Design a protein around this ligand. Structure first.
Ligand SMILES: [Mg+2]
Ligand SMILES: [Zn+2]
Lengths: 114, 192, 237, 396, 123, 148, 150
RNA sequence: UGAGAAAAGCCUUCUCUAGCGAUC
């Protein structure tokens, strides 16, 4: 039993011992946003999610800067944020579209209720 | 060499003594390294996978490890310097919690007199500020260790008793802080 | 746009061992960097909290396209010995070295002397890569340097691929081992149709005491390309 | 079926004897266990001779001979000694079999049951020769695999660019460390003699003077004259003495003085290693990329290689992308760094940067693939840059 | 010859190469210059690479063979940059040119025949 | 879904045809005295490569001395002999599996139940004997086929 | 398991019963010899093998040979050397051959085998031992000198 | 489905691989 318990704390040797992070309200908020990425952009379509639940083993990081992609692919440091949800809070394009869709549903629902 | 030797200072001294693998066989490392280990070090010299380095490459490596050993010599002198000033300014605190922990306690408050104004409960949880405010907002259980976790008395005790010892040490420690801050005589009689 | 530098991203394991998924606004295929802080061919890397992963480009590598295409087995796992035929500069070889890890070994064979110098420089940084600058058509000329292996990966792009693979499989491949062979239909026979070539190549494998098990195309990334996975001298069940 | 097999390995040559085997049904599911299982393999195969290689150079010579199919002197020494002289010898290469049969009367066979036995020997080789050699079989193959590859391509160990990337990273690291320690030194000595920070503008110069004068109480006569030599001008040294005589500083304890002197000494010793590393980088760049160093300078040229990640990667890039590698730090835009005769106007600053990038791309290609590197091409490219600079500045 | 210019075309193959280059230029299927030849290799739209062995530094085109080995793109050398200039339809010598992949092009049969001939030179 | 098929049209099937011959197709060709290679070329106006599997060859041998003539015709240097590793001798499942894998063959058979199985597989033509001539079923490029 | 050990004990029985014929050994001594021989035999026929078991087996047989040699002089019986002593020496040679096959790299075992061959074995058996030694240990010049010295 | 269902601690019976053993 104790040797089983130790083996479930890590992904295993096949993936070089990835650990399961402690779940928090900030980590859970990020994973919920990733699942609902289909509705962020009306002109972008995605495949179905691999699993309905959250993955047991995962890790969080940022993409390293490259000298070659100074103009092609690089975000200025003022626009960078600490977490995924704050990035969604910042950009105007996603906020502008989402508030129009949400208001339309409520305006439809208000007529539905009446 | 990196796998067999873990002491960083011992590693750099061996490099400073001998540059290349060829001179491992002739040279002697008895004063730096135990005789049983140096035989393993000497044996691995013949069976090596590394590439041969140029004369300029080995000279640059020698200059780097020379700088490494001098930092330890100065850091030891700086650590001995800290023990002397802690003994003169706050002798009673150093006897109780230690030189390093007492120095970190003073640095956190910014001064000895600022630390004296604090209560006994605050000194216990002085280091653990991130756990305190997280627990207070979420209405969870408060931390109990703080910077006192690295004290000598707290370290020796069993994990079940590390909670009781922390508050007993912290309550007694502030008594040494007040007397060292306000008393006009420097002695270790009370702290002992 | 794309995956710009400075974006938060999540990494989760793939179905295959040693391979990872880079989940975000886009999903990329990544492997754990054996030498952190270095890019082999300018790929984008992600820093994880001491741990670093490198993106895998399916257009410049045929193994990545097969994985993205939905292959069942690649048989390349950590702690395995892999014989690689046609290493070229080593773009795909670097990702293979990441999968096998420190315990596994990769044997890189490349006849070209120009591309051979790049492999040696890559072998400087990765202790698990053994460069072999020799012709793959004559396995007996380098039989001293290679022990028994588990997986043979071939990307030689020659009309006589099956003969080259069979000669290497008999000499170095262990019983129960597997092979992954990439077939460019235009190279073996330009006159015949692409799929008729694929049926002929499968037949020649059976005549060499090799049992092919699966095949698939690499259509989104390559045209008239196929990958065949099989087993050599299967053990009795 | 009694015969002898010759197995060649990176560690040495091995001679083995086969007692009995089921030849016809060997490639069948049940009989195949005879060679797969170690216990059954020991039953029918024995090790009669083993000759390890003395050194790596000896191993490399034998590896070349085996590949060419000729018989090395070491191989004949083993064969003549332990083979009776009507003998069946198994070899993996038909060419080496014919060569042995010419030199010695042994009959050589290259196929059949022998090919299957050799796979059994290859699978179980480490068990048969365990402990007979000091160097392990796994490392011997790794060691021989490299040295065989270098000989074929004529690899040159001097023209390896690894040290340049390591040096650039450390030079950036050393600069940050020196600046941080120098700030604390000035603050600590500011408690005793605050006037010195205003006169001296260099962190390295400040620490050198802090070593020279422990206390402002004793700086007079001959010590002033010696102080005048360390300072670039004698006028400031005389003003330093008046600053020492009339100062607002506080006297420091003896033990506080010993601590600051040992600390300020280390910053000086840290700085001189950084100067030595820069000299080491300059000499390394001359051997690896002389033409690139001639065109743009050793410091800028080494940084361009660091951004590319290798000298080969820099050459493979097109001319347009090479400019972008210097876009963040303005390596091409900021011209005094690289120094050129003449100046470029703000209107033509962009054009000169594009032209300079193309020349550096060509220079990197010359350095990368050369039989011998030579800096004559770099000087010619530099002269072309000056001609274009003079063309824009004067108009012709 | 410089030994680095290994796939050197003979007299007969040179005439076929230069004829195809001039035909490809009429169909807007040719990229001219060392820098432009590199870009097509990065984008994977190249049939084959033709280079001139008479460049006074041969070193400036030696990066192109390295890129060809990774993309499995055939390449050859010719003896004259001036002769290569005329077929490319330019008034200056050219040291490297690239034939571009075009869908539905009617030069496919001529291009395919040349690719087999180039591969034959490498034994 | 295979990339060869443009809906129900097989584009990679080319003028050199590789075709799988059934054991009963050989016997009925001899009864009508139709040369195997020659009659197939008349139907398609192209070069045709008849292919014989090990299972199909095995069934001919099991027929005995009465069917020796068909056995000698089956071993013909122009023919393409391809192996198959199946525990058994049943040939209909052997041919059907090869149809599913590669989609490049044309099935030549006269058995009714086998033909109804192949029709469920998309993009593969069926060849059969009608009257005293060869006929093709699901080929757009039939050309010189019997017209009815 | 015990079938091989049983074969070896039944092979050891005839020299023990001849020794009982001699009067050199008593019946209880024969019983004790059988018991200890079986105990030592069980150790070297296992699936997991150690060198010290082979060493103990060899040492026990050497001690038995020495005891027989001491007692024969006191009795004065010099007949039937071949029935007992040669059988024991052959068994010890078989044990040494198995041990040397299992552990080739151990020079000390080879030297002990050479010493026993010098003391108790025919000169041709010692000649075969040196050839086996020099075949796999030809990189040690000292072993060449020892063979030439003999 | 219907010795209902659910959870903990002890014995009994047995299944897979993987080394190891066969060199006298
Ligand atoms: Mg039927
Ligand atoms: Zn069949």
């Amino acid at each position: 039993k104790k040797r089983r318990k130790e083996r479930q704390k890590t992904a295993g040797d096949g993936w070089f011992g990835m650990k399961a992070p402690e779940m928090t309200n900030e980590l859970k908020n990020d994973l919920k946003a990733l699942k609902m990425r289909a509705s962020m952009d009306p002109k972008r379509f995605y495949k179905k999610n691999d699993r309905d639940g959250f993955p047991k083993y995962f890790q969080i990081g940022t993409i390293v800067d490259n000298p070659a992609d100074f103009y092609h692919s690089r975000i200025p440091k003022k626009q960078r944020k600490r977490t995924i949800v704050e990035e969604l809070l910042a950009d105007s394009e996603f906020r502008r579209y989402n508030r129009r869709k949400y208001s339309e549903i409520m305006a439809e629902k208000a007529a539905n209720a009446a | 060499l990196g796998k067999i030797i873990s002491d960083n200072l011992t590693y750099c001294k061996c490099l400073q003594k001998v540059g290349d693998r060829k001179n491992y066989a002739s040279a002697k490392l008895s004063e730096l390294l135990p005789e049983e280990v140096e035989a393993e070090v000497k044996a691995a010299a013949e069976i090596s996978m590394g590439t041969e380095v140029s004369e300029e490459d080995i000279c640059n490596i020698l200059h780097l490890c020379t700088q490494v050993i001098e930092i330890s010599e100065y850091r030891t002198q700086l650590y001995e310097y800290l023990q002397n000033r802690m003994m003169a300014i706050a002798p009673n605190v150093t006897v109780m919690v230690g030189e390093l922990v007492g120095a970190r306690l003073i640095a956190h408050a910014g001064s000895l007199l600022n630390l004296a104004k604090h209560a006994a409960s605050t000194v216990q949880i002085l280091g653990a500020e991130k756990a305190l405010f997280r627990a207070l907002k979420s209405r969870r259980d408060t931390p109990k260790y703080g910077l006192i976790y690295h004290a000598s008395l707290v370290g020796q005790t069993s994990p079940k008793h590390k909670g009781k010892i922390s508050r007993m040490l912290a309550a007694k420690t502030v008594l040494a802080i007040r007397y060292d801050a306000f008393g006009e005589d420097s002695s270790s009689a009370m702290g002992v | 746009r794309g995956n710009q530098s400075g974006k938060n991203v999540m990494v989760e394991p793939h179905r295959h061992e040693g391979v990872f998924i880079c989940r975000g606004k886009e999903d990329a295929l990544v492997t754990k960097n054996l030498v952190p802080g270095e890019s082999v061919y300018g790929e984008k890397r992600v820093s994880i909290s001491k741990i670093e992963y490198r993106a895998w480009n399916p257009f410049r590598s045929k193994l990545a396209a097969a994985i993205l295409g939905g292959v069942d087995q690649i048989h390349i796992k950590p702690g395995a010995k892999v014989l690689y035929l046609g290493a070229a500069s080593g773009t795909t070889v670097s990702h293979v070295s990441d999968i096998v890890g420190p315990d596994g070994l990769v044997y890189a064979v490349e006849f070209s002397h120009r591309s051979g110098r790049d492999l040696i420089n890559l072998a400087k940084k990765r202790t698990n890569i053994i460069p072999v600058i020799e012709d793959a058509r004559h396995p007996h000329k380098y039989r001293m340097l290679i022990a028994m292996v588990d997986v043979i990966f071939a990307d030689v792009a020659q009309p006589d691929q099956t003969r080259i693979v069979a000669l290497n499989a008999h000499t170095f491949l262990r019983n129960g081992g597997h092979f992954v062979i990439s077939i460019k239909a235009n190279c073996i026979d330009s006159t015949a149709s692409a799929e008729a070539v694929f049926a002929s190549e499968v037949k020649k494998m059976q005549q060499e005491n090799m049992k092919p098990q699966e095949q698939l195309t690499l259509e989104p990334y390559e045209r008239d390309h196929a990958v065949v996975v099989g087993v050599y001298r299967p053990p009795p069940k | 079926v009694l015969l002898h097999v010759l197995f060649e390995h990176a560690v040495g040559y091995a001679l083995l004897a086969l007692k009995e085997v089921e030849e016809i049904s060997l490639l069948q599911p049940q009989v195949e266990e005879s060679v797969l299982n170690l216990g059954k393999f020991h039953s029918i195969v024995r090790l009669v001779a083993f000759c390890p290689f003395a050194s790596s150079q000896v191993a490399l010579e034998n590896a070349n001979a085996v590949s060419e199919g000729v018989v090395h002197e070491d191989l004949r020494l083993l064969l003549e000694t332990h083979l009776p002289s009507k003998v069946l010898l198994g070899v993996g290469d038909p060419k080496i079999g014919a060569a042995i049969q010419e030199e010695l009367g042994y009959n050589c066979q290259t196929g059949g049951v022998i090919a299957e036995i050799l796979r059994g020997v290859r699978l179980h080789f480490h068990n048969l020769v365990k402990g007979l050699t000091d160097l392990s079989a796994c490392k011997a193959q790794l060691g021989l695999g490299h040295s065989y590859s270098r000989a074929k391509v004529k690899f040159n160990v001097n023209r390896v660019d690894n040290m340049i990337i390591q040096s650039i990273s450390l030079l950036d690291q050393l600069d940050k460390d020196i600046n941080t320690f120098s700030m604390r030194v000035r603050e600590w000595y500011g408690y005793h003699f605050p006037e010195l920070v205003k006169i001296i503008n260099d962190n390295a110069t400040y620490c050198r003077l802090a070593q020279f004068i422990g206390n402002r109480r004793e700086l007079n006569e001959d010590k002033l004259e010696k102080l005048e030599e360390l300072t670039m001008d004698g006028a400031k040294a005389k003003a330093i003495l008046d600053a020492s005589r009339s100062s607002m500083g506080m006297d420091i304890s003896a033990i506080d003085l010993i601590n600051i002197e040992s600390f300020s000494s280390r910053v000086v010793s840290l700085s001189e290693y950084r100067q030595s590393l820069h000299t080491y980088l300059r000499s390394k760049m001359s051997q690896v990329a002389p033409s690139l160093s001639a065109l743009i300078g050793e410091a800028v040229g080494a940084r361009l290689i660091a951004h590319a990640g290798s000298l080969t990667n820099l050459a493979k890039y097109p001319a347009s992308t090479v400019q972008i590698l210097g876009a963040e730090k303005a390596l091409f835009r900021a011209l005094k760094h690289s120094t050129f005769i003449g100046r470029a106007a703000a209107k033509n600053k962009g054009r000169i940067s594009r032209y300079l990038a193309n020349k550096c791309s060509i220079a990197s290609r010359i350095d990368c693939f050369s039989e011998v590197p030579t800096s004559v091409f770099g000087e010619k490219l530099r002269e072309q840059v000056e001609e274009r600079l003079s063309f824009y500045e004067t108009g012709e | 010859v410089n030994p680095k210019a290994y796939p050197l075309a003979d007299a007969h193959l040179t005439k076929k190469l230069l004829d195809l280059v001039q035909q490809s230029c009429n169909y807007k299927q040719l990229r001219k210059g060392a820098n432009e030849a590199t870009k097509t290799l990065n984008r994977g739209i190249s049939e084959f690479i033709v280079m001139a062995a008479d460049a006074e530094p041969l070193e400036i085109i030696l990066h192109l063979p390295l890129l060809c080995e990774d993309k499995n793109v055939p390449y050859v050398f010719v003896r004259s940059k001036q002769a290569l200039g005329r077929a490319c339809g330019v008034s200056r010598p050219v040291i490297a040119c690239s034939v571009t992949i075009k869908e539905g092009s009617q030069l496919k049969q001529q291009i395919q025949s040349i690719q087999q001939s180039i591969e034959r030179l490498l034994v | 879904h295979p990339s060869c098929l443009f809906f129900q049209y097989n584009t990679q099937l080319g003028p050199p045809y590789h075709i799988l011959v059934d054991t009963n197709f050989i016997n009925f060709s001899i009864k009508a005295k139709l040369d195997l290679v020659q009659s197939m070329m008349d139907c398609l106006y192209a070069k045709c490569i008849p292919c014989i599997t090990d299972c199909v060859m095995a069934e001919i041998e099991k027929l005995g001395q009465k069917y020796r003539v068909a056995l000698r015709i089956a071993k013909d240097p122009r023919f393409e002999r391809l192996p198959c590793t199946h525990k058994g001798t049943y040939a209909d499942d052997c041919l059907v599996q090869r149809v599913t894998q590669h989609k490049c063959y044309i099935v030549a058979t006269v058995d009714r139940d086998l033909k109804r199985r192949i029709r469920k597989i998309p993009g593969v033509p069926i060849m059969y004997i009608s009257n005293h001539r060869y006929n093709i079923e699901r080929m757009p490029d039939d050309y010189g086929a019997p017209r009815f | 398991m015990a079938e091989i050990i049983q074969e070896r004990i039944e092979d050891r029985l005839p020299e023990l019963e001849q020794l009982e014929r001699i009067g050199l050994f008593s019946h209880a001594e024969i019983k004790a010899i059988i018991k200890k021989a079986s105990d030592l035999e069980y150790k070297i026929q296992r699936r997991t093998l150690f060198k010290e078991d082979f060493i103990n087996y060899v040492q026990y047989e050497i001690n038995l040979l020495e005891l027989i040699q001491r007692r024969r002089t006191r009795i004065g019986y010099s007949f039937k050397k071949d029935e007992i002593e040669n059988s024991i020496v052959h068994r010890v040679q078989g044990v040494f051959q198995r041990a040397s096959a299992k552990w080739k790299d151990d020079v000390q075992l080879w030297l002990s085998y050479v010493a026993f061959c010098k003391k108790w074995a025919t000169k041709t058996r010692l000649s075969k031992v040196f050839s086996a030694m020099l075949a796999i240990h030809s990189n040690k010049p000292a072993l060449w000198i020892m063979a030439a010295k003999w």
